[PDB]
Amino acid sequence: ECTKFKVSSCRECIESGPGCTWCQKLNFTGPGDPDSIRCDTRPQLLMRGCAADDIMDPTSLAETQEDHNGGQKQLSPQKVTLYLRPGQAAAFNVTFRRAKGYPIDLYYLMDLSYSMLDDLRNVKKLGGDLLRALNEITESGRIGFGSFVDKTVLPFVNTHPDKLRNPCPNKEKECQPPFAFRHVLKLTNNSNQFQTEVGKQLISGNLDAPEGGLDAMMQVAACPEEIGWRNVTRLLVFATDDGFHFAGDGKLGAILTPNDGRCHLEDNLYKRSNEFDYPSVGQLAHKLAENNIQPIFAVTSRMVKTYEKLTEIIPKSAVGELSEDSSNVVHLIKNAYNKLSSRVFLDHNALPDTLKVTYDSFCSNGVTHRNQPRGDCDGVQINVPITFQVKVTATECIQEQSFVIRALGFTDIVTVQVLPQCECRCRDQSRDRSLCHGKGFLECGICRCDTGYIGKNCECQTQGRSSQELEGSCRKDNNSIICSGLGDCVCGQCLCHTSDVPGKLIYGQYCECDTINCERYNGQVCGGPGRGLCFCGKCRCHPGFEGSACQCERTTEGCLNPRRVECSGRGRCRCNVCECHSGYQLPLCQECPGCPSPCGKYISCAECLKFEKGPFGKNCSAACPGLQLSNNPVKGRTCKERDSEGCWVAYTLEQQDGMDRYLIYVDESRECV
């Protein structure tokens, strides 16, 4: 509903709420009614006498610009404009469509530690297969190569002059001295160059169990011209079999200077590696994002679970189980590419907190998400349109500004222009000035007055004293103090005072409402600005909150177990907190401590189901209501008792959703006395 803080001009009604509306007809206000009545919820305006052509919300709206000649537009509209309103979100439908024929640039960055010897043996004869598999998706592909080991300093590698020459543990074998990063091959469409340049690489080794490849990826991002990236799809395969060093590890080597992310390549070697630490994971993640490079973490089975956590930090990255000899590189790359292209993340660039950009996603295969922080969809087919309902809420009447929406991993962007629709376009200015006593001017049906006059019709001059007959009308009843003692009558309306105490606004028609008198939660009125606002004894909540002081949420409920039932079916939950019956405990009621084992009294049930005995006088199905037998073992309480035949029935009783219902699994190897 339209809650109004003493509004007195058309645009103030829009600032004062998302559902509020203004009406322009002159008949809408009588002598005893304040101009604030112009602002209320739309049906009440219709009931009072407003009309569909006399009303002006104004609704937040969008304009979409598109190119007719542009075929297979991967991200449309090209640019949009929003006449945003505070609180009332605008919506517009950005459409995504997967295109064909977009080439691929593949850079292969590999660990050269001693455990990667066989992987390096297999990779050096893989360039042609990788390039052809790139061509099997889209034509005109390119490949590259890159290598890392670790920083050339203790503890990470021993600095003895003999061991620096030959760091690999097998002394007999011939191996290259340690290095941080070496750029090996330029991005080319020739397989011969790949099989030539890579073949000159030799194995190496460090001392520590992690490796430095985070700073190699940081250099592969920092050196665009040397690597050879086009403005096309860029892939970065990262092949490791163990963990990585990251920022902070350099203190053991007396290194404390941060990695700066600039291109420090000299003669294809990352010289000056020891004067910089390792980068943080956030450095790599952020820098790859601002260059449209998509990491493919080819990691071994033991490291998969560790590397999955990077994807929460790095969108447009994929992790795949790499074999112990990197035999499945091509299949892993293809699967990662399919996952990357089907998983279309659609996210904006950073924007002021005054904008609450929100996405509704109508994905393709029947799934739909609501109020997600970023657009989410999966299984995006080729040439199958997808729709994202971008919901943009302002709360400010923002100054005209702009942000960019982008489909992550793609250069295509949507420019969004945003403008304050808070101004009013009332046509009443054409009316004669006689209505404003010849002093003010009439717009939206209210006689707006200059600095020299005040009042509903500019009847009261700012220099003249207030008439007693006008002051006497600012009372609810004979017992009410003038303006409730918290204001003054100015031309028949209470000009409210302000309170030196923090946050105490005084408002309402007779200056009788204070925003601090509602009942408190955690010592704050309505829980503070973060939960709701006070209207002289009544609390209005933001969406997602309810109750007398907005202390009770209506969303992201903690009542719900992962099976989507309230308190596991054995308790109501008032105000997001489950309330239980009997000896059940918070929060999800999953287990009951203290209640004795009921196994001894369900023997009457287990005696029938698993053994298929006939009725016990009373029918078996009615003898054991609310229970099911499982064909597979189940987890929970274990029990053993004696049956009617004197045999040991060893069974388990897993509790499930609802009240007094379980699953029973009984051992078939019956033993009897």
């Binding site: 503890p155 021993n158 003895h160 941060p258 943080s280 950073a350 939660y521 010592g523 019956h581």
Partner: protein, 848 residues
């Protein structure tokens, strides 16, 4: 705010690495390491002892050994003030052996003079972090056992003990345990906390305790984000200064968010056998990605003067690696405040500062003013952020006369008088003399602040506002200024109101180096005083009333803290004699309660703490009576004592004397909610055969597992009833209670006779064999402290005696023993419904 930067003292040195590590030393000396300054062949790292008086630094004449060290000396430092000790370690001693160059640590312990010192599992880097215990230095090896970690605790230069975790499937490899270390005091007994910033890839921090001589790891916590590097720095904080540690701070400088970098978390000490868990997280400013917030941690003691320990946290990555430092206050609830109190930025100090805040040290006074000083490290610079004394201002406005005379206001030469008193006080204790602290204060007085056309003006300005400035000492100072009313007032409904708001500027202390006082950030900067008009409710007489208050916890027997969470009291207020103006009722109640709502008059209320409720402002009619339900919220973890003393008294603008009925107090019993569950267990011998040919001795056991699922540690008295004899024949021989958890308790036995003599017919009626068919013994075990969330297996064991077996109609008999948990009902109670499980029984069935 408190830490000074306008006149910050600075040390410069062209030494490579100068400012990497700083520790304060007793007096006015600071030891600064330069872990990269080369001074000789194969020698890098030297100590620089810096003095406030000399304004410079000279190297400590240390006799470094000749074993091709490259110690990187000064990378780690430690010190204590009583006795005077200081520890310097070189983590990286490059021992170039025949095949490999190992890295070990070498350690220097100094006394009062920095002249000569002792110097006394490869790859260990023994002195990566250092601490001085009450028996010697504590050295941390980040690289022991394949970079798993560990520490060496030294009692003497010849004897030491290694401390680390138990090894489980190489999960602790590369963890770097000992990358940070700290000492926690438990009843003045030394205990250890260690950090592993690389654990797996998420991080880990653990506590080590001296449980019966040996060092064991009892609790540990883990980090969330990969690469956040959780555990880089540790800081044990004793917030309350009682002599026991309260919190451990765990820094994760590389936590990554879209607009933030780095976080620190608060982990209060676990109580009893409870699991250790975090409860808060701290963050730097937004828009400062890669700020490395939480790289440096230190204890500054009490900075603002409130007896609660405060922490400073380094953020050297902010503003393009020019860095910042964050000050966090400790809170009275044994916590740390979620938001920083001060940020010091290297930009505002000097353009030359890089990596500002990479090192911190605090705990001692170096300026000899009596205030703790913080020393901060930077690349080639060291600064002394001296803590400035905190000044609070108490303003007393006393209108004379106390109320506006009737003839002065009733319908422009009319006048009044107000006395304003500004009193400046120190929140901290220090060595500054009287008269040294000078402050310049400017304040504004506003008559009818918040209203247009104010009803009163000042005499010396002839308008409703006055600004005044003066230089004030640390003592009571007063000045009196007259007031005027420019008009008559025909609506005397609300007083004249005076507002005072001020800003304080502290003059620099010339003797101590231009140190300035600072006004407290939480000090009340706005003061309001009411100048009420005279009333006329009578034959021109002065107003008076007989206001009284009574209230009762009606239909309420005892207050249960654990539930329900809300209780409300029927407060009634009665007035007699004459009308009362602006009646306010103040409720004084323990800190653990809070105020929610007031219901049924224009009745509105605002919040030993206090709560003032406005009973129908401005007036409360003749002979009126009002009843309302002041609703309070009781904390779940509250501790109100044995009884809670609510105290409320009423006041009015008439300022009548404190009659005996104007104050009411009524203590109600406090009865802490506990929830204890006792149950049998499956291992109990629930069934046996029948044996009647000859008597036998067979052992059987009933385990009445006891748990505490509430949030109160309580003393319990636990009782078993065990059959011992039936028909003059023993069923049990010697029932021996046993506890497997070794908790301290004592047990005894008592025997009592059966309640019924009809054992020949009760068996015919039912096959139950308990203390109503047989003689039973009573084993009572007293436990003085049963803690929170702890369980023990109270078990009974003894040999059954088949000397009484009765061949009744039922082919089975039941030996029943019942265990019920008695507790002092005067203080403790069970919750309704769920409290039926305080007792349990176990039956041993005997049949074919």
């Amino acid at each position: 705010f408190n830490l000074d930067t306008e006149n910050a003292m600075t040390f410069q040195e062209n030494a490579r690495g100068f400012g990497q590590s700083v520790v304060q030393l007793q007096g006015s000396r600071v030891v600064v390491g330069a872990p990269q300054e080369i001074v000789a062949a194969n020698q890098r790292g030297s100590l620089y002892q810096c003095d406030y008086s000399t304004g410079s630094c000279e190297p400590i004449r240390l006799q470094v050994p000749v074993e091709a060290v490259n110690m990187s000396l000064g990378l780690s430092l430690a010190a204590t003030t009583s006795p005077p000790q200081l520890l310097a370690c070189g983590p990286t001693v490059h021992q170039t052996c025949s095949e490999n160059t190992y890295v070990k640590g070498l350690c220097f312990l100094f006394g009062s003079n920095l002249r000569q010192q002792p110097q006394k599992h490869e790859m260990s880097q023994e002195g990566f972090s250092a601490a001085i215990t009450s028996n010697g230095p504590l050295l941390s090896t980040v690289g022991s056992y394949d970079w798993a970690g560990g520490v060496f605790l030294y009692t003497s230069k010849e004897k030491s003990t290694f401390i680390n975790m138990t090894r489980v499937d190489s999960d602790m490899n590369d963890a770097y345990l000992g990358y940070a270390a700290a000492i926690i005091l438990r009843n003045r007994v030394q205990s250890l906390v260690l950090g592993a910033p690389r654990y797996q890839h998420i991080g880990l921090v653990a506590m080590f305790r001296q449980n019966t001589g040996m060092w064991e790891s009892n609790a540990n916590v883990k980090g969330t984000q990969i690469g956040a590097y959780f555990g880089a720095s540790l800081c044990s904080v004793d917030v309350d200064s009682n002599g026991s540690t309260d919190l451990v701070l765990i820094g994760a400088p590389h936590y990554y968010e879209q607009t933030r970098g780095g976080q620190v978390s608060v982990c209060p000490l676990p109580r009893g056998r409870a699991r250790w868990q975090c409860d808060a997280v701290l963050y730097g400013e937004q828009g400062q990605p890669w700020g490395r917030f939480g790289a440096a941690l230190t204890v500054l003691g009490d900075v603002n003067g409130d007896k609660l320990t405060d922490v400073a946290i380094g953020a050297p990555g902010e503003e393009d690696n020019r860095g910042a430092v964050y000050l966090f206050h400790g809170t009275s609830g044994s916590g740390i405040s979620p938001s920083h109190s001060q940020r010091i930025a290297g930009s505002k100090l000097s353009p030359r500062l890089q990596y500002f805040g990479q090192s911190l040290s605090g705990g001692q006074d170096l300026t000899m003013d009596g205030l703790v000083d913080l020393t901060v490290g930077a690349q080639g610079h060291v600064l002394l952020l001296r803590s400035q004394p905190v000044l609070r201002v108490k303003a007393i406005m006393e209108f004379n006369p106390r109320e506006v005379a009737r003839n002065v206001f009733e319908c422009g030469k009319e006048a009044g008088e107000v006395r304003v008193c500004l009193h400046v006080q120190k929140s901290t204790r220090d060595r500054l003399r009287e008269g040294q602290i000078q402050s310049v204060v400017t304040y504004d007085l506003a008559l009818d602040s918040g209203r247009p056309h104010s009803r009163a003006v000042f005499n010396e300005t002839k308008n409703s506002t006055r600004r005044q400035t003066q230089v004030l000492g640390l003592t009571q100072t007063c000045e009196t200024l007259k007031l005027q009313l420019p008009n008559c007032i025909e609506d005397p409904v609300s007083p004249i109101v005076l507002r005072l708001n001020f800003s304080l500027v502290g003059t620099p202390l010339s003797a101590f180096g231009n140190l300035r006082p600072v006004l407290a950030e939480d000090a009340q900067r706005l003061f309001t005083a009411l100048f009420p008009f005279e009333k006329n409710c009578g034959n021109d007489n002065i107003c008076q009333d007989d206001l009284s208050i009574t209230f009762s916890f009606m239909s309420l027997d005892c207050l249960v803290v654990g539930g329900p969470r809300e209780f409300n009291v029927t407060v009634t207020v009665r007035n007699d004699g004459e009308d009362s103006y602006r009646t306010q009722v103040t409720f004084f109640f323990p800190l653990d309660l809070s105020y929610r709502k007031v219901s049924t008059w224009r009745l509105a209320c605002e919040s030993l703490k206090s709560t003032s409720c406005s009973i129908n402002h401005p007036i409360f009619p003749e002979n009126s009576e009002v009843t309302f339900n002041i609703t309070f919220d009781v904390d779940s973890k509250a501790s109100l004592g044995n009884k809670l003393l609510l105290k409320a008294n009423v006041t009015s603008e008439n300022n009548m004397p404190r009659t005996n009925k104007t104050e009411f107090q009524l203590e109600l019993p406090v009865k802490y909610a506990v929830y204890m569950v006792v149950t049998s267990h499956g291992v109990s011998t629930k069934y046996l055969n029948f044996t009647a040919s000859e008597n036998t001795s067979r052992v059987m056991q009933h385990q009445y597992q006891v748990s505490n699922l509430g949030q109160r540690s309580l003393p319990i008295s636990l009782v078993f009833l065990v059959p011992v004899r039936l028909n003059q024949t023993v069923i049990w021989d010697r029932p021996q209670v046993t506890f497997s958890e070794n908790l301290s308790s004592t047990c005894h036995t008592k025997e009592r006779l059966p309640s019924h003599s009809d054992f020949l017919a009760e068996l015919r009626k039912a096959p139950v064999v308990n203390c109503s068919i047989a003689v039973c013994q009573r084993i009572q075990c007293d436990i003085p402290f049963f803690g929170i969330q702890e369980e023990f297996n109270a078990t009974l064991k003894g040999n059954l005696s088949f000397d009484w077996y009765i061949k009744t109609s039922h082919n089975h008999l039941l030996i029943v023993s019942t265990a019920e948990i008695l507790f002092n009902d005067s203080v403790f109670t069970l919750l309704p419904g769920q409290g039926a499980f305080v007792r349990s029984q176990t039956e041993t069935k005997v049949e074919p």
